Amino acid sequence: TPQNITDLCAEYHNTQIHTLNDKIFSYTESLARKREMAIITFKNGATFQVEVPGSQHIDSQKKAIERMKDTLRIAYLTEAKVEKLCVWNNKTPHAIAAISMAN
Amino acid sequence: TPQNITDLCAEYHNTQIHTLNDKIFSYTESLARKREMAIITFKNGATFQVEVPGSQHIDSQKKAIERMKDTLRIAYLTEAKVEKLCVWNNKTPHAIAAISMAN
Amino acid sequence: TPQNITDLCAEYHNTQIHTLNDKIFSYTESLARKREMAIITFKNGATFQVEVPGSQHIDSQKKAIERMKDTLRIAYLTEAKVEKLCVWNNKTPHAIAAISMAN
Amino acid sequence: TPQNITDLCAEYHNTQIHTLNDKIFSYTESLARKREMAIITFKNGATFQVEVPGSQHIDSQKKAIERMKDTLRIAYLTEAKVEKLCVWNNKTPHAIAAISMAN
Amino acid sequence: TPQNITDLCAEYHNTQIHTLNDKIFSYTESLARKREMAIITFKNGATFQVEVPGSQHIDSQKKAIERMKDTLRIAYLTEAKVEKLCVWNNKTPHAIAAISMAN
Ligand SMILES: CC(=O)N[C@H]1[C@H](O[C@@H]2[C@H](O[C@]3(C(=O)O)C[C@H](O)[C@@H](NC(C)=O)[C@H]([C@H](O)[C@H](O)CO)O3)[C@@H](O)[C@H](O[C@H]3[C@H](O)[C@@H](O)[C@H](O)O[C@@H]3CO)O[C@@H]2CO)O[C@H](CO)[C@H](O)[C@@H]1O[C@@H]1O[C@H](CO)[C@H](O)[C@H](O)[C@H]1O
Numbered sequence: 334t335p336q337n338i339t340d341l342c343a344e345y346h347n348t349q350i351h352t353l354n355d356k357i358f359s360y361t362e363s364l365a366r367k368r369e370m371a372i373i374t375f376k377n378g379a380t381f382q383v384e385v386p387g388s389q390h391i392d393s394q395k396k397a398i399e400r401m402k403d404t405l406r407i408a409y410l411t412e413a414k415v416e417k418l419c420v421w422n423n424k425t426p427h428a429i430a431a432i433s434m435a436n
Numbered sequence: 437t438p439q440n441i442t443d444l445c446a447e448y449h450n451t452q453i454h455t456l457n458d459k460i461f462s463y464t465e466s467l468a469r470k471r472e473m474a475i476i477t478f479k480n481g482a483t484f485q486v487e488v489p490g491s492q493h494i495d496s497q498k499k500a501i502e503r504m505k506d507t508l509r510i511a512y513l514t515e516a517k518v519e520k521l522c523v524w525n526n527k528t529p530h531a532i533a534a535i536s537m538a539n
Numbered sequence: 540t541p542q543n544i545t546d547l548c549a550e551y552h553n554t555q556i557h558t559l560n561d562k563i564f565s566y567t568e569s570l571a572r573k574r575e576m577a578i579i580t581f582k583n584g585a586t587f588q589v590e591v592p593g594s595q596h597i598d599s600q601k602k603a604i605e606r607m608k609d610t611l612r613i614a615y616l617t618e619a620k621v622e623k624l625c626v627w628n629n630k631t632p633h634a635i636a637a638i639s640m641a642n
Numbered sequence: 643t644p645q646n647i648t649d650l651c652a653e654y655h656n657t658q659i660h661t662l663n664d665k666i667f668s669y670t671e672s673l674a675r676k677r678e679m680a681i682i683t684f685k686n687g688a689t690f691q692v693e694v695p696g697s698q699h700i701d702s703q704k705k706a707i708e709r710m711k712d713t714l715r716i717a718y719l720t721e722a723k724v725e726k727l728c729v730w731n732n733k734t735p736h737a738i739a740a741i742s743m744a745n
Numbered sequence: 746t747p748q749n750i751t752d753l754c755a756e757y758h759n760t761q762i763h764t765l766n767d768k769i770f771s772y773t774e775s776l777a778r779k780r781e782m783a784i785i786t787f788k789n790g791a792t793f794q795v796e797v798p799g800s801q802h803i804d805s806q807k808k809a810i811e812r813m814k815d816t817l818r819i820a821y822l823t824e825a826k827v828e829k830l831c832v833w834n835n836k837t838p839h840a841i842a843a844i845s846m847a848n
Pocket residue numbers: 344345346347384388389390391421423424428777778779
């Protein structure tokens with residue numbers, strides 16, 4: 334089993350690690366139909382998304398999706414420093430697959 | 437897929453962006469029959485609501501609505517500054533569709 | 540659709556507004572059978588309850604009962620000032636229908 | 643309907659009030675099979691548990707049990723002062739039936 | 746029945762206690778398929794995981810698994826001190842079974 338975000342990220346196709354070492358700059362949440370998702374940017378301008386759940390996700394992923402949204406929300410509110418992001422780069426904005434936070 | 441709230445709002449009918457750049461002034465919550473909802477106001481008098489889930493709403497929108505309510509409560513509690521709100525102006529108060537918070 | 544708590548409270552039978560403008564003094568919670576409920580009081584001795592969900596309530600009522608409880612707990616914990624409460628006066632202690640918070 | 647924890651506790655068999663007026667000393671949580679439970683202690687050594695959900699518990703019970711766990715966790719983390727506990731004294735450690743918190 | 750994490754940990758095969766008395770150093774969360782899990786680290790390098798639900802778990806443990814993730818998440822964000830962890834040492838990284846926190 335992967336021991337860290339890096340090795341975990343390397344297990345899938347079209348992924349890439351982004352090292353931020355910075356807190357989240359803005360948080361956006363949408364309840365609009367077909368656009369039920371969350372978006373975040375950082376000071377440098379990088380923008381990321383938590384994908385609207387769809388056909389490319391199995392049941393275990395749907396719940397993990399809801400948890401990831403809870404997570405970003407509280408991290409943003411408490412101004413926590415996000416270290417790294419493992420994202421799928423074949424989408425725009427890049428879709429978040431994993432996150433790590435280190436004080 | 438939109439990169440921001442403005443473009444996202446631009447994807448629906450009867451929507452509209454509101455720049456507040458201010459923390460929520462009042463938060464109201466009701467559990468009364470058929471009026472299970474939340475209402476927020478800003479110091480300028482601006483008043484918005486999170487629509488009572490309805491027949492039209494599907495499961496995805498339903499839990500999105502639940503999350504928004506959670507979002508408004510904690511944001512109000514943390515005095516988090518809200519930047520913009522994308523609302524459906526064909527209702528009174530205007531219903532919230534999306535929200536953005538900055539730093 | 541109503542825009543504030545006083546106007547909302549006025550749409551039902553046997554309700555009333557209690558103006559508090561003060562934080563909750565104590566929070567009580569129970570998991571005992573038939574009394575799975577929460578109770579709060581204010582320094583002035585005022586006491587209120589969130590009804591135990593019954594047969595009368597539909598699931599949308601039920602979910603709202605759940606949220607109110609969450610709301611009260613976190614309100615108590617953050618020491619937020621509660622402004623007004625819309626309550627059913629046909630019960631004892633008076634049962635909560637809606638709540639508003641503002642500073 | 644009871645208005646305080648003492649009166650509510652008095653409605654059952656084999657219960658008892660414990661007055662603590664102190665914050666939680668430690669919090670323990672387990673996911674191990676048949677031990678999916680929470681245990682809390684106070685500085686004076688006192689120890690209490692939230693029973694593992696079982697067959698006797700109706701939806702309202704199990705759900706109330708899940709809530710009690712969220713409550714104790716957050717009470718612990720925020721260092722909230724626990725006033726009294728209503729517990730079943732025919733179980734070791736004594737099992738929590740209700741809780742009250744005051745400043 | 747068991748009063749502490751040590752005794753509880755003792756009821757299973759392949760377990761072991763780790764006394765840490767320190768705060769979580771990094772927190773990692775993933776929503777990738779078959780990797781819907783969490784991983785934590787402590788300053789000395791020690792790594793632990795919450796296992797992806799599997800056939801070795803029942804619905805009761807599945808709930809508890811979601812709860813443990815929420816727990817690790819707030820503990821981290823709040824820099825709470827974890828005292829001990831009961832883990833399964835037949836896996837890599839070590840799988841968390843129970844956790845104790847004390848100021
Ligand atoms: C790259 C891709 O299209 N992935 C989609 C996936 O397709 C399957 C194979 O991809 C992997 C992968 O993503 O790397 C292979 C991994 O080892 C799998 N790992 C595990 C632990 O299961 C994952 C995993 O199944 C998915 O990520 C879960 O959603 O899938 C893909 O390579 C394969 O297609 C080959 C084909 O076999 C070969 O003959 C041909 O020559 O080349 C193809 C491309 O390499 O086909 C597999 C399906 O039959 O399928 C899932 C849905 O079932 C998704 O569509 C996944 O796409 C990504 O989904 C992400 C969410 O999980 C996210 O939205 C990304 O943005 C999507 O591209």
